Structure 1
Amino acid sequence: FERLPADVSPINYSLCLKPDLLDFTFEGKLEAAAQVRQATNQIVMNCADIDIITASYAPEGDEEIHATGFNYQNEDEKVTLSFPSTLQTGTGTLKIDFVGELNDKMKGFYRSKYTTPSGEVRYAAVTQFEATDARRAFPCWDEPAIKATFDISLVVPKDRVALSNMNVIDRKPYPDDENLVEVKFARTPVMSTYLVAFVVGEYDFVETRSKDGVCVRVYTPVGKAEQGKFALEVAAKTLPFYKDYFNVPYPLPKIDLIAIADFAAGAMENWGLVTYRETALLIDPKNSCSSSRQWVALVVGHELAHQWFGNLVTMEWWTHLWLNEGFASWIEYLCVDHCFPEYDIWTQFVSADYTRAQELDALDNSHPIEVSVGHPSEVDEIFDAISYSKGASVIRMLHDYIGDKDFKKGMNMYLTKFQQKNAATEDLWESLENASGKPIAAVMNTWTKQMGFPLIYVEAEQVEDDRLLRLSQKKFCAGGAYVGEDCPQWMVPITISTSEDPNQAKLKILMDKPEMNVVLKNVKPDQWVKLNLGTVGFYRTQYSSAMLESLLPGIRDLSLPPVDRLGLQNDLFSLARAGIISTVEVLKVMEAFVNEPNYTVWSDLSCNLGILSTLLSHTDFYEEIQEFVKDVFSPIGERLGWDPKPGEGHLDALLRGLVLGKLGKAGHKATLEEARRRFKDHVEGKQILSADLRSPVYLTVLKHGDGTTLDIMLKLHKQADMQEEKNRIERVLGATLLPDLIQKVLTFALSEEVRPQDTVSVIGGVAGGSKHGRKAAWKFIKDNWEELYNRYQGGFLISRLIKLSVEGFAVDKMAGEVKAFFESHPAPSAERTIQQCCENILLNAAWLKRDAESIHQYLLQRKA
């Protein structure tokens, strides 16, 4: 919070760091050449774990003055190296012989567990400095604003492999002992301290030169080179993509992409040795599907994006941290768009983060992305899924509003401006404004100021060939009634798109005002003009009834892009609470999905319709909505059939799984009978089908199954060995409905605690199995609150559990009941989410009281 006095600015580092395995200890020299701008007798070194042996400062050429200061502000992770004499001004060198250790808390310079092919459960030395962690490994100026060059040199056993930021330039012998050698790397360029990384372990060499010439390399343990080959190709394709993209050379002559056994942090951007989780990076050709390859391509390109935004121009302070990830995230998608065009990634991208962006802002705790930071500890709770998703959405907004070439020029100018120098978010806005001319900062300042996304009451005025209307900017509310005490209007650059060309927006306005007018040349009397374009604008366009009817034929067929169709589908479900008609219109858009083949549309449609079905518990008539689901799924179930069909992709496999599961949720008689048939065939072993179909088959058969099938399911789980297969089996067997069966499966969920920390997902499945059974399970976990809390001590797992358990509630009285339950049961880590869910429940109740009864009448029109 206090930052540092910063009396001395580091220049160069010389770190003869020596890890000591089998003792988990650490030695070093820490010879730092720096400049003492402030004439002070005291030196501030932020560092926590290190125990300084000796320190000595020699200014320029004269003799050193040793050290007479060791004030250990342990709580502040600070150390004061006071000296008897003044240090005035000049360039000096501080040599600090010290000691540290490989922590087991997987922080700073820790030791990770890895297993050789034979076993031996040995340990390796690994690094990660996310925030205030570099100082724990070895004392420096742990400040992003502080920038200096480093010369990392390692003292490593010769059998062990060692990698660092730069390329190896020397492999000298170690004079004291010949079982280990001194590896000296090249001098790093100007970079931040938290970006320093060096690892030591046992891996194997897999190199691949790039078109530019840089050897992108991976070091999987046990030489599982094959596992790490697809990512090599992805990197070798996307790095030159960056090079030709912004015409800036890669900083490090060497780039490495090593993976670590149970990294426990997922990934971390570093200067040329970006570390990964083993599961995230390596890919067994026979133990993976194309979606996993898509995910690994996404993650491998994300850190390569971080190599440019980040390393080259680090954020001035953690307040701007949101950018360094957020912007990069969007960049990464664009990269894959240029790498695997067959992988249409924007389609799932809209469903990947944009959905929780939309749903999370609707609720409370929607704090603006840019929150002032003074202490790096605040990073943890200023951080959430919003910080990633909304940041990526707004940066993609900016790219669209600026244009591809103009954004290119702005990024190139910004990189060339403050290369190796800390820059603020305002500096990026200034550079973008210099490139384009239109004021980006005039919108970014408000984007930092307020919190959320607006709404528009569109209109309809087709004067000959001019479809003019009045966009009305106002704040959005989950219920619909926004607070609006301040100025709720925004200046979102909603980029309208002409629907004649699905990808090309012939008409597109950079509208940024609460009120405005339109200028266009209409092509067709029903042009079904698409406001926004593929939900590039992070926003919740509210179309009028005339607009919905005009675009209805566009969504009946495949003329509208699938991204537009899914965005509209998600918008209507959210706008059931705020916009009028709701269910009635909802039904009409359902009609369009008689012809939708897109998988992601079916996935988010199933999410929405399951939300409705669970939400309609209190007013019952599930048979009516399930019948409507059957009406929707008739052509889809026919086209997909039941059995695997020739020409089916992995996306088609997900299609068959979802359609079968939701058809069983509806409870079709013939579908249920066939599912029972295949259940019998599999349990007998006469015909065992794919697990992908099998798990939804379990869900369907137990949707109308007795206890014997439940016992058979438990048995099959017992002989089953594949962990996620058993997890799927448990979560789908949580979907029994009979009250005695639901009580029994609750007690069996107490029995199904076998899965390590997957018990949370099992009990989430059992909670989501029924609707009134969900309330019974809520009472059950009330009776087992202490068991759940002793299984999970304030983790994200328990917050996900409680959110899943209470998401289906729409009664204010028991909303207050569960609120009091949580008040008597403080869970601070999940605390925010707690009230979030509570408010959600209230909204749910309101939404029910808005339309549920009239829904009956709509069904009376459906069957008529």
Structure 2
Amino acid sequence: FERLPADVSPINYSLCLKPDLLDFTFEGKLEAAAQVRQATNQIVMNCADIDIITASYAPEGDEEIHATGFNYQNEDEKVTLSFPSTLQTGTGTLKIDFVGELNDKMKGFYRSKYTTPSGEVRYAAVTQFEATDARRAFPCWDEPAIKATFDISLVVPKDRVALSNMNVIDRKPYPDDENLVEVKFARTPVMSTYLVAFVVGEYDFVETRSKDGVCVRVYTPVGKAEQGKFALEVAAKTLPFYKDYFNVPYPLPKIDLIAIADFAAGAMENWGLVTYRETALLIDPKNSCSSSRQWVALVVGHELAHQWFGNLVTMEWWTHLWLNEGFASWIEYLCVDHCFPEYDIWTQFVSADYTRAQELDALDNSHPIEVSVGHPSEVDEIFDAISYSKGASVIRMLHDYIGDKDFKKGMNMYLTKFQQKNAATEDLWESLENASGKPIAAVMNTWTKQMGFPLIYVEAEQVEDDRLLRLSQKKFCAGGSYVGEDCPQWMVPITISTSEDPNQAKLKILMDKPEMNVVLKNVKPDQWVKLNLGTVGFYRTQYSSAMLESLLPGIRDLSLPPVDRLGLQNDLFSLARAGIISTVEVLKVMEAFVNEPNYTVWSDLSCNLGILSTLLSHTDFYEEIQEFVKDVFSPIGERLGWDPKPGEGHLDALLRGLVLGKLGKAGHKATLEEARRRFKDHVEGKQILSADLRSPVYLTVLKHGDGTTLDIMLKLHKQADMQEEKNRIERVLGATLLPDLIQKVLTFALSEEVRPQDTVSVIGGVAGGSKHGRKAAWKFIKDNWEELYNRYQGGFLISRLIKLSVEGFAVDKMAGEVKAFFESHPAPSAERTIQQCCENILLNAAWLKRDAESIHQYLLQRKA
């Protein structure tokens, strides 16, 4: 792959598109003011799905020279326009009229099917250019570093709204068609082609004015303007936040957020015309959830952050796309936390992007964040959950290492320097290094140019009133000690806190050595020391036995902040699974979480303990681990109770469902008895139970029930009114333990009553229900493999079916059985999932064989 010759660079695009609705085509003429930087007889542009009618180049004050040479290259999406004579150095005007198609590929200038408040089913002209789809709406230099200005004009019917990046400056009628009106927009600033936008359709709107004076609007489908009210007030507060943080005002005169029906791309940060899907922007009071208002605040703060970082300063090439998306994925939480501190959104960030990035970065076949991108198709291949989640995580670690003071100063220097220009990743490290005086380029190279993350072991020794800390780093792997003689090293900024001040840094350091000693002044032995305050650093911490015991009071009295308790527990399970520490040592810490009130902490607690419970189901003491789980969740269960208390939040309703479901599955007698009261009153029409208590009650009564309970659930599903109620049952049907009922649920999955896209959910619940239910699910998909393979081959569902079925196995002999099955019955699209699952089975197998009897003897001694 090679970029455009750059002998002719654009200056201003004058576009006038007439979307031909019903015919699903469009015609448009382009007057592109350009500069010939080098004498050439041909101009090379990007173009796809567009046939040029005629094209001519008119130099300044001269007659136009029509192009008599066309060359369409579809594999490279580039077209060469040859001319009889050399165009020579200077400024000219390239005039190109052409015709295009409003395709159904949800890319470029395509058609978007929407339904009126009555029906009829109409289509709209919606745009989407990122990454390289602007060449499908009009021929252009479709590269982010080839910036120019845009004059957008649209010839739309009178009964349809036409929006674009800028505001409307003229609305003159169309001469050839009285039913059409040409809408001309203002001239955009210097910007990239992939950020241009224009939409034609029928939309209602709600408007407001931000404190900066910017006109804010939220465009909704016809008849849903009230649903975009919340997104409006969030966007109205988001702009002043980024204005104060960047010390740079909003670069455009207006901001528009339009909700589109079934928008495939989800959300696009088009400069001045941010597009969303209505299921992610609007809040339907009779269909939305509880945390929906939280999800809207995040998606608004993310795309509005791109209006500065991404649109005002654009990446030089797609190699730096991780930094564009990683920064926005981090600062979106900073914006929501400032406007809504009652969310404690940083605890959910650690539970989302942070932990998911550490899972992938600790396994084989990982890759560094920044990878050189040649062809723009290589993007979709080498960027995944690693480049974005770990990308946002290293930005958070960098912000804490810099400090909010110097970080704001460096970003203001960065934006003002490269405004309406392009910059690389190294340019950002320079602007931050100038404002902070810290070696940012050197530190960030260890986190971007190599894969993996370090494990920080810390040991403590009391020296007078100070405490000496001995730190060492090594590459962390989910299997254990990293086998390899390269010995990776990281420059690790580490924030340390003590019990005297658990919410602010006791000492900030930078570990640029494999081993390093640190002295914490005035630290009494009765005080605990916590590494990685706020879990801002992208690394795992292994505490010594003495240091871990010192942290136990901090967990119990909640003095350790919730984000720190979340990261501490998550590291312990990873280290125990990797064989670095014993599982018994982790189980003793679980007893200190009995006072945990935070929902996010319990969610990760329940997830980790669920992995261990299903692992220990292969042993002869599965009753002992269930009794252990009941003791951990009993106090929080009694605190929450069964009915909502006066003045609860939305997380408290979610936390009640998680705790009660955990106790119900573990056999908690008081929970099982109450769940049967609610379930028998729900099926007899005496008092329908809440939707929050519905899933835990179903799980509890079905696991401890019989064939009568299963028939009741099947009657509740075949009679279920909506689809949502059906899915809530399909996930819990696998909780039955009786073999003949398990086979009945598996056969029910492939029946006509269950839709094929939800069949994997039913079988998934069977594999996760019990040990024999997992073996029955694995045998079920082998006997019916011909039907199941024909159903979901080449799709996402076949990888999800294999994942949910075999990941629970804890026998190393079983890992060799799933590998031998897919070598005789190939599944090509799920080749990567089989390798990850086989490595996960062997990991759980070694983990199980190493710590089985140790856990057993710990549970027996603890009970006495």
TM-score scaled by length of structure 1:
0.98
1-side partners of 2:9 and 2:748: how far apart? 62
* Kept in 1: contact 2:132–2:194 (CA 8 A): yes
Which residue does the alignment assign to 1:710? 710
Segment drifting more, 790-799 vs 39-48? 790-799
Question: How much does 1:756 deviate?
Answer: 6.2
* Kept in 1: contact 2:44–2:78 (CA 8 A): yes
Change (3 A) 1:826 1:376: farther
Which residue does the alignment assign to 1:169? 169
* Kept in 2: contact 1:810–1:848 (CA 8 A): yes
Question: How much does 1:498 deviate?
Answer: 2.7
Change (3 A) 1:826 1:50: farther
Question: How much does 1:414 deviate?
Answer: 0.5
Question: How much does 1:638 deviate?
Answer: 1.7
Question: How much does 1:210 deviate?
Answer: 0.8
Change (3 A) 1:609 1:680: same
Change (3 A) 1:581 1:67: closer
2-side partners of 1:75 and 1:703: how far apart? 56
1-side partners of 2:331 and 2:664: how far apart? 40
* Kept in 1: contact 2:39–2:87 (CA 8 A): yes
Give secondary structure in 1 for the equivalent of 2:96: strand
* Kept in 1: contact 2:541–2:571 (CA 8 A): yes
2-side partners of 1:356 and 1:321: how far apart? 19
1-side partners of 2:709 and 2:159: how far apart? 56
Question: How much does 1:786 deviate?
Answer: 4.0
1-side partners of 2:165 and 2:509: how far apart? 46
Question: How much does 1:725 deviate?
Answer: 2.7
* Kept in 2: contact 1:325–1:388 (CA 8 A): yes
* Kept in 2: contact 1:752–1:762 (CA 8 A): no
2-side partners of 1:811 and 1:209: how far apart? 62
Change (3 A) 1:440 1:663: same
* Kept in 2: contact 1:313–1:421 (CA 8 A): yes
2-side partners of 1:314 and 1:823: how far apart? 46
Give secondary structure in 2 for the equivalent of 1:191: coil
Give secondary structure in 2 for the equivalent of 1:256: strand
Change (3 A) 1:132 1:827: farther
| 1:392-435 CA distance string (max 9 Å, x none) | 11000000000101000100000011111110000001111111
* Kept in 2: contact 1:473–1:488 (CA 8 A): no
Segment drifting more, 708-717 vs 122-131? 708-717
Change (3 A) 1:70 1:816: same
Segment drifting more, 845-854 vs 323-332? 845-854
* Kept in 2: contact 1:144–1:317 (CA 8 A): yes
2-side partners of 1:522 and 1:763: how far apart? 58
Change (3 A) 1:475 1:585: same
Give secondary structure in 2 for the equivalent of 1:450: coil
Change (3 A) 1:756 1:243: farther
Question: How much does 1:827 deviate?
Answer: 4.5
Question: How much does 1:837 deviate?
Answer: 1.9
Segment drifting more, 748-757 vs 78-87? 748-757
* Kept in 1: contact 2:584–2:854 (CA 8 A): no
Question: How much does 1:826 deviate?
Answer: 4.8
Segment drifting more, 616-625 vs 674-683? 616-625
Segment drifting more, 787-796 vs 623-632? 787-796
* Kept in 1: contact 2:491–2:513 (CA 8 A): yes
Which residue does the alignment assign to 1:445? 445
* Kept in 1: contact 2:458–2:470 (CA 8 A): yes
2-side partners of 1:579 and 1:464: how far apart? 34
* Kept in 1: contact 2:745–2:762 (CA 8 A): no
Segment drifting more, 193-202 vs 346-355? 346-355
Question: How much does 1:807 deviate?
Answer: 1.6
* Kept in 2: contact 1:363–1:840 (CA 8 A): no
| 1:217-259 CA distance string (max 9 Å, x none) | 1110113122111111111111111112221111110110001
2-side partners of 1:452 and 1:245: how far apart? 32
Change (3 A) 1:808 1:75: same
2-side partners of 1:536 and 1:87: how far apart? 56
Change (3 A) 1:223 1:13: same
Which residue does the alignment assign to 1:542? 542
Which residue does the alignment assign to 1:743? 743
| 1:769-820 CA distance string (max 9 Å, x none) | 2223112212212233343344334333432332222221222222122123
2-side partners of 1:760 and 1:634: how far apart? 32
Give secondary structure in 1 for the equivalent of 2:276: strand
Segment drifting more, 282-291 vs 610-619? 282-291
Contiguous gaps of at least 5 residues in structure 2: none
Which residue does the alignment assign to 1:35? 35
2-side partners of 1:175 and 1:258: how far apart? 30
* Kept in 2: contact 1:457–1:471 (CA 8 A): yes
* Kept in 1: contact 2:430–2:441 (CA 8 A): yes
| 1:57-78 CA distance string (max 9 Å, x none) | 1111211111111111111111
Segment drifting more, 643-652 vs 750-759? 750-759
2-side partners of 1:174 and 1:314: how far apart? 36
Segment drifting more, 605-614 vs 523-532? 523-532
Change (3 A) 1:506 1:457: closer
Segment drifting more, 549-558 vs 574-583? 574-583
Question: How much does 1:753 deviate?
Answer: 6.4
2-side partners of 1:673 and 1:65: how far apart? 87
Segment drifting more, 356-365 vs 719-728? 719-728
Give secondary structure in 1 for the equivalent of 2:455: strand
* Kept in 2: contact 1:542–1:579 (CA 8 A): no
| 1:622-648 CA distance string (max 9 Å, x none) | 111101011112212222223444443
Give secondary structure in 2 for the equivalent of 1:497: strand
* Kept in 2: contact 1:366–1:452 (CA 8 A): yes
Which residue does the alignment assign to 2:22? 22
* Kept in 1: contact 2:467–2:523 (CA 8 A): no
**Identity rate, percent:** 100
Question: How much does 1:461 deviate?
Answer: 0.9
Give secondary structure in 2 for the equivalent of 1:123: strand
Question: How much does 1:581 deviate?
Answer: 4.6
Question: How much does 1:580 deviate?
Answer: 4.6
Give secondary structure in 2 for the equivalent of 1:496: strand
Flag the structure with higher strand content. Answer: 2
| 1:8-44 CA distance string (max 9 Å, x none) | 1011001111100010011000111111112111211
Asked if 1:507 is matched to 2:510, the reply is no
Segment drifting more, 724-733 vs 110-119? 724-733
| 1:423-473 CA distance string (max 9 Å, x none) | 000000111111111110001222222111101221111102211121101
Change (3 A) 1:788 1:33: farther
Give secondary structure in 2 for the equivalent of 1:18: strand
Change (3 A) 1:363 1:581: closer
* Kept in 2: contact 1:72–1:80 (CA 8 A): yes
* Kept in 2: contact 1:16–1:29 (CA 8 A): yes
1-side partners of 2:308 and 2:833: how far apart? 34
TM-score scaled by length of structure 2:
0.98
2-side partners of 1:752 and 1:459: how far apart? 61
Q: CA RMSD in A?
A: 1.6
* Kept in 1: contact 2:117–2:223 (CA 8 A): no
* Kept in 2: contact 1:69–1:83 (CA 8 A): yes
* Kept in 1: contact 2:47–2:135 (CA 8 A): yes
| 1:524-554 CA distance string (max 9 Å, x none) | 3222111011211111111111111111111
Change (3 A) 1:258 1:230: same
Change (3 A) 1:796 1:502: farther
Which residue does the alignment assign to 2:110? 110
Change (3 A) 1:693 1:536: same
* Kept in 1: contact 2:577–2:583 (CA 8 A): no
* Kept in 2: contact 1:752–1:759 (CA 8 A): no
* Kept in 2: contact 1:365–1:832 (CA 8 A): no
Give secondary structure in 1 for the equivalent of 2:5: coil
Segment drifting more, 309-318 vs 792-801? 792-801
Give secondary structure in 1 for the equivalent of 2:131: coil
1-side partners of 2:470 and 2:638: how far apart? 43
Give secondary structure in 2 for the equivalent of 1:611: helix
Segment drifting more, 248-257 vs 479-488? 479-488
Change (3 A) 1:463 1:230: same
2-side partners of 1:698 and 1:48: how far apart? 53
Which residue does the alignment assign to 1:693? 693
* Kept in 2: contact 1:555–1:565 (CA 8 A): yes
Give secondary structure in 1 for the equivalent of 2:9: strand
* Kept in 2: contact 1:149–1:189 (CA 8 A): yes
How many residues align? The count is: 864
* Kept in 1: contact 2:466–2:523 (CA 8 A): no
